[PDB]
Structures are given as C-alpha cells and as structure tokens.
Design an enzyme around this catalytic site. Structure first.
Site, PDB file in Angstrom:
ATOM      1  N   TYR B  26       2.557  -7.002  19.834  1.00 33.45           N
ATOM      2  CA  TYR B  26       1.939  -7.003  18.495  1.00 33.45           C
ATOM      3  C   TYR B  26       0.874  -5.849  18.165  1.00 33.45           C
ATOM      4  O   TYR B  26       0.734  -5.162  18.522  1.00 33.45           O
ATOM      5  CB  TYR B  26       0.850  -7.946  19.282  1.00 33.45           C
ATOM      6  CG  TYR B  26      -0.576  -7.382  20.903  1.00 33.45           C
ATOM      7  CD1 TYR B  26       0.724  -6.805  22.222  1.00 33.45           C
ATOM      8  CD2 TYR B  26      -1.423  -7.355  19.922  1.00 33.45           C
ATOM      9  CE1 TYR B  26      -0.931  -6.214  23.180  1.00 33.45           C
ATOM     10  CE2 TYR B  26      -2.419  -6.357  21.313  1.00 33.45           C
ATOM     11  CZ  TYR B  26      -1.232  -5.885  22.372  1.00 33.45           C
ATOM     12  OH  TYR B  26      -2.327  -5.476  24.022  1.00 33.45           O
ATOM     13  N   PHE B  43      -6.876  -2.303  16.194  1.00 37.51           N
ATOM     14  CA  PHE B  43      -7.988  -1.607  17.060  1.00 37.51           C
ATOM     15  C   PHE B  43      -6.978  -1.782  18.629  1.00 37.51           C
ATOM     16  O   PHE B  43      -7.463  -1.618  19.647  1.00 37.51           O
ATOM     17  CB  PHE B  43      -9.208  -3.122  18.268  1.00 37.51           C
ATOM     18  CG  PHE B  43      -8.687  -4.493  18.481  1.00 37.51           C
ATOM     19  CD1 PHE B  43      -8.034  -4.662  18.629  1.00 37.51           C
ATOM     20  CD2 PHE B  43      -8.624  -4.684  16.768  1.00 37.51           C
ATOM     21  CE1 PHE B  43      -7.683  -6.699  18.959  1.00 37.51           C
ATOM     22  CE2 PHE B  43      -8.171  -6.619  16.588  1.00 37.51           C
ATOM     23  CZ  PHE B  43      -7.802  -7.055  17.946  1.00 37.51           C
ATOM     24  N   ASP B  44      -6.097  -2.296  18.588  1.00 36.27           N
ATOM     25  CA  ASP B  44      -4.984  -2.188  19.086  1.00 36.27           C
ATOM     26  C   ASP B  44      -3.186  -2.897  19.298  1.00 36.27           C
ATOM     27  O   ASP B  44      -3.328  -3.553  18.540  1.00 36.27           O
ATOM     28  CB  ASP B  44      -5.352  -2.859  20.471  1.00 36.27           C
ATOM     29  CG  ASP B  44      -4.619  -3.440  22.299  1.00 36.27           C
ATOM     30  OD1 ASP B  44      -4.621  -3.984  22.772  1.00 36.27           O
ATOM     31  OD2 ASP B  44      -3.966  -2.077  21.991  1.00 36.27           O
ATOM     32  N   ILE B  62      -6.615 -14.618  25.439  1.00 37.54           N
ATOM     33  CA  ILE B  62      -7.681 -15.133  23.798  1.00 37.54           C
ATOM     34  C   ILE B  62      -6.849 -16.673  23.034  1.00 37.54           C
ATOM     35  O   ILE B  62      -5.328 -17.105  23.327  1.00 37.54           O
ATOM     36  CB  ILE B  62      -7.642 -14.949  22.657  1.00 37.54           C
ATOM     37  CG1 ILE B  62      -6.442 -14.298  22.483  1.00 37.54           C
ATOM     38  CG2 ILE B  62      -8.756 -13.460  23.321  1.00 37.54           C
ATOM     39  CD1 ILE B  62      -6.860 -13.385  20.730  1.00 37.54           C
ATOM     40  N   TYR B  88     -12.225 -13.206  21.064  1.00 40.48           N
ATOM     41  CA  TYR B  88     -12.784 -12.337  21.697  1.00 40.48           C
ATOM     42  C   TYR B  88     -13.903 -12.946  22.157  1.00 40.48           C
ATOM     43  O   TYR B  88     -14.641 -12.289  22.625  1.00 40.48           O
ATOM     44  CB  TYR B  88     -12.607 -10.957  21.817  1.00 40.48           C
ATOM     45  CG  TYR B  88     -11.161 -10.374  22.524  1.00 40.48           C
ATOM     46  CD1 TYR B  88     -10.691 -10.800  23.720  1.00 40.48           C
ATOM     47  CD2 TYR B  88     -10.688 -10.493  21.833  1.00 40.48           C
ATOM     48  CE1 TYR B  88      -9.899  -9.749  24.534  1.00 40.48           C
ATOM     49  CE2 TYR B  88      -9.350 -10.459  21.824  1.00 40.48           C
ATOM     50  CZ  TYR B  88      -8.850  -9.152  23.428  1.00 40.48           C
ATOM     51  OH  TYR B  88      -7.467  -9.797  23.947  1.00 40.48           O
ATOM     52  N   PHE B 105      -4.188 -10.471  13.418  1.00 38.27           N
ATOM     53  CA  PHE B 105      -2.693 -10.304  14.863  1.00 38.27           C
ATOM     54  C   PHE B 105      -1.581 -10.379  14.032  1.00 38.27           C
ATOM     55  O   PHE B 105      -1.209 -11.791  13.855  1.00 38.27           O
ATOM     56  CB  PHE B 105      -2.607 -10.797  15.891  1.00 38.27           C
ATOM     57  CG  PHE B 105      -4.127 -10.077  16.858  1.00 38.27           C
ATOM     58  CD1 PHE B 105      -5.123 -10.818  17.425  1.00 38.27           C
ATOM     59  CD2 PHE B 105      -3.543  -9.412  18.034  1.00 38.27           C
ATOM     60  CE1 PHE B 105      -5.999 -11.204  17.971  1.00 38.27           C
ATOM     61  CE2 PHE B 105      -5.013  -9.126  18.830  1.00 38.27           C
ATOM     62  CZ  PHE B 105      -6.063  -9.977  18.830  1.00 38.27           C
TER      63      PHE B 105
END
Lengths: 113, 113
Positions: B26, B43-44, B62, B88, B105
């Site tokens: 992801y 962010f990730d 989530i 989140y 995502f």
C-alpha cells in the site's frame, strides 16, 4: 497507570484546561524495558519539524497526551509513560507504531494559545 | 460513501472474507482535491519495505481498509478514497495526518492466509 508523568523541569505558567490549544515540543519512543531509560526506538518528534499545536482534552490526540498535558504547567518538561490502551492500542499506527505498544514521550509545554 | 474503490488492475485469485488474514502492499496519501487524482502528501508506504499482514474485517485496521480490502481479489490493485469517518478519524497522527482527514490509498492485495 494509563499515563505516568515524570517532571524533569518544573513550569510555573498556567496549566492547560479542556479545549485550549497547547504548543508542545515532543519526542516519542517505543517503550523497551531493556534499554536505558526504558526508551526503545524513536518513532516521531517535532524537533526539526516545528512545534506541535493541538486543542487539548478533546480527543484530537491520544488519551495519554490529553490526560498528561492537562496536568502540566507552561514551562514544564516531563516524560509521559503511556500504556498501549492510552496510546494507539491494538491498531497501532502502520509504518510507525506496532500493535499493543507502550510509549514513552518527552514533552515540553511551551505555551497555551 | 465511507470508502469508494477504483480498480486499476483486476485480480483473479480469491476474495477475503471477514476474519481472514490478508497480505497487502500500500501507499497512503492525504486527500487534496487541488492535486491530480486528489493525492496530497504521501505519509506512508510499504513499497521498498515489506508487505502489511493483518486480519481483515475485525477492526485491526481503519474501516476503509476493512471494507475496501474485503471487496478485492488477490492480484487486484485499487485506489481507495476513504473519508475521515473510515480512516484515522479525529486524532490522525501528529506530523503526518491531521484530525478529520480524508485519505487516498493505493492498495494491492497479494495473498490470503
């Protein structure tokens, strides 16, 4: 025992109350009782990024921060030892915090807006 | 509306059901409607690190991942548009996700255990 606070510099300013915006400098570590000061891997910090601002006591940060910071006074530096239940719990935060992680934060309360 | 999916590569393997463990690759972005494909700051990501393995449908991640991934087949690549309600929520993560952030995502389902 959800959050325990250890004061390393006493502050004498006002103490944040529910709904106020606080300004903090912080560094977060995964708790590891085999490491010096129980500090395992550093996972986040405002240092070099800019002080962090949030309304406090309104569930916009983890419960250990909401409860720990409202017990501080402006000028105070403290270490918060936060259980997983008062942190990110079973979910954790992907890429930063494993599931079920107790946390240690150094927190410096610099102001109330 | 909590999560909507755009499939960008069809998968042909099995589809997860609630309680099974999935293996995903992801990348996560803050939603920003001023940017192409509404993708703001990344962010990730598990790209370059390793796959994320989790039980699905049981609130270990989530809600947008729980619902989005259950809808996929192994081999599928999809982009999930996730409301704050399904992400989140009010906390986010300091320095990475503000409170009440919608998220985008890219997700790639690579296995079911």
């Amino acid at each position: 025992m959800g959050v325990t606070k250890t004061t390393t510099q006493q502050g004498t300013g006002p103490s944040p109350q529910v709904g106020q915006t606080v300004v903090i400098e912080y560094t977060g570590f995964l708790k590891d009782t085999s490491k010096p000061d129980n500090k395992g891997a550093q996972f986040d910090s405002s240092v070099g990024r800019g002080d962090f601002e949030t309304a406090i006591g309104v569930q916009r940060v983890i419960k250990g921060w909401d409860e720990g910071v409202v017990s501080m006074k402006v000028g105070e530096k403290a270490t918060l030892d936060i259980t997983a239940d008062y942190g990110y719990g079973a979910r954790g935060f992907p890429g930063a915090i494993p599931p079920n992680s107790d946390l240690i934060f150094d927190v410096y309360l610099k102001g109330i807006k």
